[PDB]
Each structure stands twice: as structure tokens, then as C-alpha cells.
Design an enzyme around this catalytic site. Structure first.
Site, short mmCIF file in Angstrom:
data_model
loop_
_atom_site.label_atom_id
_atom_site.label_comp_id
_atom_site.label_asym_id
_atom_site.label_seq_id
_atom_site.Cartn_x
_atom_site.Cartn_y
_atom_site.Cartn_z
N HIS D 60 -30.83 -55.25 -50.98
CA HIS D 60 -29.41 -55.30 -51.29
C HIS D 60 -29.18 -56.00 -52.64
O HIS D 60 -28.17 -55.77 -53.30
CB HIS D 60 -28.63 -55.98 -50.14
N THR D 192 -19.03 -60.63 -49.29
CA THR D 192 -18.75 -59.31 -49.82
C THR D 192 -19.76 -58.31 -49.24
O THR D 192 -19.74 -57.15 -49.64
CB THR D 192 -18.82 -59.27 -51.36
C1 LIG Z 1 -25.55 -68.20 -46.46
C2 LIG Z 1 -25.59 -66.70 -46.33
C3 LIG Z 1 -24.86 -65.91 -47.18
C4 LIG Z 1 -24.91 -64.52 -47.07
C5 LIG Z 1 -24.13 -63.66 -47.99
C6 LIG Z 1 -23.73 -62.32 -47.91
C7 LIG Z 1 -22.99 -61.93 -49.04
C8 LIG Z 1 -22.85 -62.93 -50.02
S1 LIG Z 1 -22.03 -62.78 -51.48
N1 LIG Z 1 -21.92 -61.32 -52.13
O1 LIG Z 1 -22.10 -64.05 -52.22
O2 LIG Z 1 -20.70 -62.99 -50.99
S2 LIG Z 1 -23.65 -64.38 -49.51
C9 LIG Z 1 -25.67 -63.93 -46.08
N2 LIG Z 1 -26.38 -64.68 -45.24
C10 LIG Z 1 -26.42 -66.04 -45.31
C11 LIG Z 1 -27.24 -66.88 -44.35
C12 LIG Z 1 -28.33 -67.73 -44.73
C13 LIG Z 1 -29.04 -68.52 -43.81
C14 LIG Z 1 -28.72 -68.49 -42.44
C15 LIG Z 1 -27.66 -67.67 -41.99
N3 LIG Z 1 -27.31 -67.61 -40.68
C16 LIG Z 1 -26.29 -66.82 -40.26
C17 LIG Z 1 -25.56 -66.01 -41.14
C18 LIG Z 1 -25.83 -66.00 -42.51
C19 LIG Z 1 -26.88 -66.82 -42.94
ZN LIG Z 2 -22.98 -61.80 -53.80
#
Ligand SMILES: Cc1cc(-c2ccc(S(N)(=O)=O)s2)cnc1-c1cccc2ncccc12
Ligand SMILES: [Zn+2]
Ligand SMILES: Cc1cc(-c2ccc(S(N)(=O)=O)s2)cnc1-c1cccc2ncccc12
Ligand SMILES: Cc1cc(-c2ccc(S(N)(=O)=O)s2)cnc1-c1cccc2ncccc12
Ligand SMILES: Cc1cc(-c2ccc(S(N)(=O)=O)s2)cnc1-c1cccc2ncccc12
Ligand SMILES: [Zn+2]
Ligand SMILES: [Zn+2]
Ligand SMILES: [Zn+2]
EC number: 4.2.1.1
Lengths: 251, 251, 251, 251
Positions: D60, D192
């Protein structure tokens, strides 16, 4: 814990020694007009007589426990639920609000305490950013008797004893607050008693609420607190902003 | 070495007779305003109640050990980690700050000692320019009991004896410091005890913090030092600037 | 590493991708007047003719290695020893100073590199605050042959080959610099070539040094560098201040 | 889930159909200047060459794992620690930023994702207001090769296949961001990508960072995504503000 005497509040709750405590002195000159601050929206505050609400002298304040379904929005996507409201007051010819404006302390103050809808329990919300929100309004002396407040003040005699409670009919909770929901100060601070948790969003109305001199004397003269003592002057000392900027919803 | 009688400090540490020592008398009218001095940045200072912090009477001061993670910057890329804080104080109605302002000695002084992130060890930083940085604040008498300082002062009885120590809950270390992080004096000097190492950047807040009369009494009257002797007047005499200009962050 | 082509400088040394690099564009209206910045002091810069000094074409610059006993102070207690000096320059009809003023690039620039007296070895000073200091002056055309520069420039033909060197009599090194030591800009940055280590205190003179047209042509037109190519345009592109404030010793 | 194809995001992840999603279109003229928005503070971001950092093609985006000790503040007491950063980009001839300004999409965009220090774990912070905070900067085309971005862009060829990863030397993370930390837009929105959790404070720098056209091409053209197809146009469509007013730190 108690007002005036020991134990020292930081011994009771460490958080009471945080840098970003409440209440504060609002200096309208130093406040930052922020046009993003929209009018407050309350839903469900117009309660019917039944079910009745618990009103308690907890030895620190008079507290009204609020039922489920009182919703409050600080703006889009910033949604809260009411838990309780309570009051801070002075004594005979000595004001006792918590917040001051340019050094001026008002006769008394109402708090409506709210939980963010993102949290199910208060213990998870404590200390977290925007976890709790308090709506505050100053109460001043006016010529007329306030009839919304009379529903509560007329019941104070039944709970004169510390740690006593009574049940009272539901009422229009929003009629205990000003009618101008568009003019307010907002800052981030703390609970003004233990556990003194930070992360709390304070909204202080610019418009005041008016009570009669008799009503103000009922509030300040009826209830008893710890010891052989009257429950008066139940307010915490003003706390430094320490670099925080109070926002204002109006120029 | 000790405060008071012999030995003279230049005999234990010859560096104590260097040209660029601390503390100094601050004369604000002779300070050089530089707009390049930006507000201090202190991050990671809001400690949770656990783990606990070592507090120790070392014979010369009361010292609080600080954990990793307290980051501080004096300017862009000029970063520091807090190691410890300690205090300098007087006796009954005799002030004991180390820095003076136009000859005025304040009741007491807090020092938060830091290590440059450019040096892995304290012993590499000693005597090197900007290796060590200390944030200094004056403690004055005020009417209110100070919450942040009470967490430390209420524990001194536990450690009255030279060399004794205790463990205290985590606190917001930044609450011990004045409101305005944008207003300070800054100069280069030395440690104020042996080994009197030079190259220390002193930052002295312009605004003070206030403790109650009883709090200041607790500080000066509770601890014991070397001999059968009170731990009091634990400040060094004022040193000459020898051509150094003290800077100011404000006009 | 080379000017013009590969390898990319961050792969050679990661410090070359720091946020706080040199050289920079000096915008005097955005400079902060600081009256703590006193006149620069040099001691020992007037050398006898023997022992001779080494003058080397290292492929990137022409560099003069300085002997022990050249001392420079940026102020009281801020003392340095000179290690070497070298030049940066352009090509016929093209300026090659490193620093710019309001976007103006000057014909050439001299750098005099110093080590803080708090450090015995350069490798211990690299990346440490104030560990290295460079004095920088722009070179411009004037009407007269500069006799101090002529002693170096008249030997360039001897060291035209990359990696070559020659011995030159000692001279008054301070005559390679402006006579006005009181008016200067000062900021914190980096070495302008690998290893691009930060913590370097740059002092850039307001007054320029004057060479004849012929002298400036000798500088740009005599030496050879990597490949079968002329040693010309040996300057790094202007780096962003990224929030740093350049100070000035004058309003 | 993926970019371009099926399934539609509210089927994988119903939070993606929430009322307060990201990214959004910024119309600076409709933004609300709030002077309470202070300069961002980022301490700890200047990493040494060792230890190394994990850089990963995840199908991604390309994602750099950041170590402990990168502290960030949005305001007094409102602190965060950096977790990771990653990028969004277009393809040959087409821009791929997530946020747009008055309709304009930029070549690319960097996101530095942080966790509120009021929460021990990320999973506690999801969906909670202020729980996560993202710093966003646009990447534009410029004349020069960017030193800071080159450390990442040069390593992309070794991780071109979906799910592959490499170790890179420590770099200065702050050097990937714009010069002026005082000038930004700020609103509350979402991730996002799925899980599209809300409560995320977005801070979008007013100023851009600049990369050579070669560098942007390396970014868009080196990595392989889901299927046996290229990793490109990895941005989400702009989402409605639904009453949210975007704030600006500058008039
Ligand atoms: C901190 C984090 C951000 C993201 C993001 C998805 C999309 C973005 S962005 N385009 O900055 O908004 S950041 C995905 N997974 C995690 C993540 C990181 C580490 C543990 C997690 N546990 C549950 C859910 C998400 C976890
Ligand atoms: Zn991002
Ligand atoms: C929300 C709450 C506020 C307070 C307050 C103390 C002081 C204030 S004031 N003076 O409005 O800031 S509010 C104390 N305890 C609780 C509390 C603490 C823990 C659990 C609770 N459960 C239900 C309702 C309230 C709970
Ligand atoms: C950091 C340090 C401060 C001090 C201080 C002496 C005086 C001050 S004060 N009044 O802030 O200047 S701070 C003394 N010794 C050490 C010290 C000195 C030498 C080695 C050390 N190793 C570990 C920890 C501390 C070490
Ligand atoms: C001090 C030094 C400067 C430089 C540079 C100095 C100055 C530049 S410039 N354009 O002035 O910034 S690059 C390169 N290597 C060394 C260096 C690095 C390591 C050991 C050394 N020993 C003796 C003399 C120099 C040593
Ligand atoms: Zn209250
Ligand atoms: Zn000290
Ligand atoms: Zn140079």
C-alpha cells in the site's frame, strides 16, 4: 480530602500536581478569538418530572446526578454525554466562583460534567485528551428570583447533613445555564478537585445566570460539611495558565 | 568538600578558580537581548505515578533522579536529556538562592541538570562547551501552598539523615518551573560545587515560582548535612563575569 | 566524494542529510542583532617565514595547513585553535562563494577552520556543540594585487595536479582576512562537504577581502581535480535555514 | 482492500463511511485563523547512523519504522511519540497527494504517524479523540536533488516486490519536513486507509518540500503492489468536511 485543611491534594492524587490545572483567571484581552468555535448544542436536557434525580450533599458540593440521554456537542465530531452537575459557592458577602475574570470572583459557579462518547467509562477517560468536558457558568446577584434554580435550592434543607441525599423531580437542566450558547471561553485544564485529572475541556460562558440575594444565601448558608463546619467557600485557588492560551468564540 | 569552613574549594578542585564560574549576579539592564533565543522546549516531563523516583539527601542538597525520556532543547538541533534536579536554600529568614538579581538573593533555587545528546556520557561532557545545561528557577514566598513542591517537601522527613534516600511517586517535573518558557537569561559558566567544571550553559527563568512560608521552612529546617550539622545555606558565593555578557530572550 | 557528480553525499556520510546544514543564504533583514557578539580576537596569526607551511591541491580545494599556536576567541571563554584554511571559487564569469547574501554569490570565499580547545582531536569534536568553528570571508575584485594572497596564488602552478603539494614560507595569516573583526553574521550549521557534521559555529564577515582580477583568474584557472577536469565551481548549493536564526553583531 | 479495485472500503471496514474522514480539500480562504496554534515541537528526531531502521514495501506504501524517543507536541501538555512514516504518490505524469489545496493535487505526500503519550498502546488510541496525530507535508517538484529523501528513494529498488523489506542507516527524520514549523493547517479526521478510524488530528504544513523530477519518478515507478501490478496512485479521494472548519496557525 477537604477544602482548607489536609491531607495535601497531591498526596491524595498525584495528578493534582500537574502543570495544566483548573480553575484559572480568564483575561479576555489575552484570549485568542477563534472563529472555528461554533455555538454549543444540547439535546435531551428538557427532562420530565419522572424519573426523579438524586441530589446529594457529598460534603464538598451539592450534586445532581443526571440521567442517560443528555447529549452535548462542542462542535462537529466532538460529542459528549452529561453525567452530573454541581455548584461552587462562597459565604456571606464573600464570592466563591472557581474561575475568575481579570481577578474578579463571582458569587457562585455551576459545573455540568460530561463524558466523551468515545469512552464507555469515566476511569478510561480520566487524563486522556478531550475525555471529559465541563460546562461552567457564573451565577450573579439579580433582582428577580430564578425559578429554575428554586427547584433545587428549596430542597437543600432536606440534605443539610453531610453525606445526605434526596430525590427531586426532573427539570429543564438547560434553564440552569445562560441562553447565549455562542459566546464562550474554552481552554484545556483539569478537574478542580481530586483526582485532578488533566485532558479536561472547559467551556466558560460569557453570559451569567442571575439568582436573588435570598437564593444565593440559601445556597451558601444551608449545607454542612466535614467537622462541625458549614459548607462554604468550596472553591480551589486559581491556577496559572503556564503558557496555555484561552480561546474565545467571539471577537 | 563542604559549604562553610575549610577546605577552600580551589584546593580540592583547582577548576573552582577558573575565570568563567557560576553563579553570577544578573543585572537585567546590562543583559544583551537576542531575538534568536526561542522558547524552551521541554517534552516527556509529565511522568506517570509509576515507576517511582529516587530522592536522596547527599549531604549538600536533596536530589531527585530523573528517568530517561525527558527531552529539552535550547534551540534548533540543540537538544538535552534531564538527569537530575536538586535545590539550594537558606535558613530561617535568610535567603539561599545561588544566582542573584541586582544583588537580591531569593529564598531558594531549583536546578534541573541535563546532558547534551551529542555526548553518550556525563564524563565526556564535563568541561566541554554546552556538554551540560542547567535550567534554574528562583523560589519565592507566596500566599498559597505549592502543589508540585509539596510532593517533594512532604518526603524530606523520611531522608533527614545525611546519605539516606527514599522513593517517591512520579510527578510532572515541568510543574516545578515558571509559567513563561519564552522569558529567560542565558550565559556560559560552571558547576556551582566541585568539580567546578566550565562549559555549562545556564538558563535562568525570568519569572519565579512561589511556595508558602511553611514550605520554605520545611525545606531549610528538615535536612541534616556533614557532622552533627544542618543542611542549610547550601549556595556558593556570586562569581565575577570576567567579560561574559548575560543574554536575555526578551526586550 | 566529488562536486558535480556521484556518489550522493548522504551515502558517503549520513550527516550530509541533516536539517541544519551549511552554507546558507544570509538575509540581513531577517538577522537578529545580538550585542553579546563582540569583536573576534586572534593571537599568533603573524607567522615567521620558517618553519614553512604545506599548501595542497586535494582535488576539492587548495588547503593551507596551519601550525600550532594560532588562537582565536569568539568571545570570553570561547577559545579555539586554527587547523587549516582553504578556498572555494567559481570559473570565468561565474561566482563561486558558498554563502550568499540576499541571493548574491561572490567571486570566492575563504574558510579558516578551528578546533575548540576543550578537545585534543578533531574526531572527538565532530558533531559536538561548538566543537568546530569556521571563519568565512568573501573575496571580491579590487584594483590592487593583494600581497598576502599573492604568496599562495603564485604557487598554484606548482600544485596544478590533483593530489600535489608544495611548501610556502609562513606569513601573516590574518592578512588573508578582513581588517574589520567587529561586524559579522554568526549561525550554527555543518561542514559544507563530507562528513557534513553539525554543531559547527560559522562566523561570516560583513567586510570582504579584495584580490585583483588576475589573482581571481589564477585561483579559478590553475588547478585540476578529479577526472581530466578543472577544479572550478567547488561550492555546495545553498541549504535552507530550516528555522535557525542567523545573528548579527550590528543593528 | 486495495487502491483502484474492489472491495469498496465501507464493506471491508464500515468506519470508512463515517462522517469525519480524511483526506480533505483545504480552501485557505475558508480556514479559521486561530492564534492559539503554536509552533510544533519535535525533539529526538535527529537519529544516529546506528541502530538501523526497518523500511518495508507493504503493498500500500513504503513504510519506515521509527524507534522510541521521537517526541512531538501540538500544544502545552499535548504530546505524542512518532511511530512510523510512509508516503502517498501518483504515477508518470500524474500527481498523487492525498490532501488537495483549492482543488490542486501535489505530486506526493509524506505522513508521520504519532501516538498520544496519554495512551500506552496504539489499540487504546484508535477512535479516541487526539489518540493519533499525523504530520503531513506535500512533496513538489524542484530543481535540486533532495539529500534527505535520497536516503530512502535510493533503497526502494531492494524492496520493489510487495512484502519485501530492508534495513537502512539512521537519518535525521526532521530533515524530511518543511522549514517553518509555525505555519500549518489543522483539523480532526481519520486514517485515509481502512480501518478508517476517526479521532485523528491532522496537521498539514503550509510549506512544501522539494524533490527532483528524477526522485519523484523513482518513487512512483520503482515499487510493485497487489496483483502482479505497480504500486502507484496510492491516495484516497478527498472527503466532505460535514461542518468541520479547518484551522490555520497563520493569517
Ligand atoms: C498506527 C497505525 C496507523 C495506520 C494507518 C493507516 C493509514 C494511515 S495514514 N494514510 O496516515 O492516515 S496510518 C494503520 N495501522 C496502524 C497500527 C500500528 C500498530 C498497531 C495497530 N493496531 C491496531 C490498528 C492499527 C495499528
Ligand atoms: Zn498516509
Ligand atoms: C466524572 C467525575 C468527575 C469528578 C469531578 C471532580 C471535580 C469536578 S469539577 N469541580 O467540575 O471539575 S468533576 C469526580 N469524579 C468523577 C468520577 C470518577 C470515577 C467514576 C465516575 N463514574 C460516574 C460519574 C463520575 C465519576
Ligand atoms: C552531572 C553531575 C552534576 C553535578 C553537579 C554539581 C553542581 C551542580 S549545580 N549547582 O547544578 O551546578 S550539578 C556533579 N557531578 C555530576 C557528575 C560528575 C562526574 C561524573 C558523573 N557521572 C554520572 C552522573 C553525574 C556525574
Ligand atoms: C576538520 C576537518 C574539516 C573538514 C572540513 C572543514 C571544513 C569544511 S568547510 N567547507 O570549511 O566547512 S569540510 C574535513 N575534515 C576534517 C578532519 C576530519 C578528521 C580528522 C582531521 N584531522 C585534522 C584536520 C582535519 C580533520
Ligand atoms: Zn466543579
Ligand atoms: Zn545546583
Ligand atoms: Zn570550506
Amino acid at each position: 480530602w477537604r477544602y482548607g485543611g489536609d491531607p495535601p491534594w497531591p498526596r491524595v492524587s498525584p495528578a493534582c500536581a500537574g502543570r495544566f490545572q483548573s480553575p484559572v483567571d480568564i483575561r479576555p484581552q489575552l484570549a485568542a478569538f477563534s472563529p472555528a468555535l461554533r455555538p454549543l448544542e444540547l439535546l435531551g436536557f428538557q427532562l420530565p418530572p419522572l424519573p426523579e434525580l438524586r441530589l446529594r450533599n457529598n460534603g464538598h458540593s451539592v450534586q445532581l446526578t443526571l440521567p442517560p440521554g443528555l447529549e452535548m456537542a462542542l462542535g462537529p465530531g466532538r460529542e459528549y454525554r452529561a453525567l452530573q452537575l454541581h455548584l461552587h459557592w462562597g459565604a456571606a458577602g464573600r464570592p466563591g466562583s472557581e474561575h475568575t475574570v481579570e481577578g474578579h470572583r463571582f458569587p457562585a459557579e455551576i459545573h455540568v460534567v460530561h463524558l466523551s462518547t468515545a469512552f464507555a467509562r469515566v476511569d478510561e477517560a480520566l487524563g486522556r485528551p478531550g475525555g471529559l468536558a465541563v460546562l461552567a457558568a457564573f451565577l450573579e446577584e439579580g433582582p428577580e428570583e430564578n425559578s429554575a434554580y428554586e427547584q433545587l435550592l428549596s430542597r437543600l434543607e432536606e440534605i443539610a447533613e453531610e453525606g445526605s441525599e434526596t430525590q427531586v423531580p426532573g427539570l429543564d437542566i438547560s434553564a440552569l445555564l445562560p441562553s447565549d450558547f455562542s459566546r464562550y471561553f474554552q481552554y484545556e485544564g483539569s478537574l478542580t478537585t481530586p483526582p485532578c485529572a488533566q485532558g479536561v475541556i472547559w467551556t466558560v460562558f460569557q453570559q451569567t445566570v442571575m439568582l436573588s440575594a435570598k437564593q444565593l444565601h440559601t445556597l451558601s448558608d444551608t449545607l454542612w460539611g466535614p467537622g462541625d463546619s458549614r459548607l462554604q467557600l468550596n472553591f480551589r485557588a486559581t491556577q496559572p495558565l503556564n503558557g496555555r492560551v484561552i480561546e474565545a468564540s467571539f471577537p
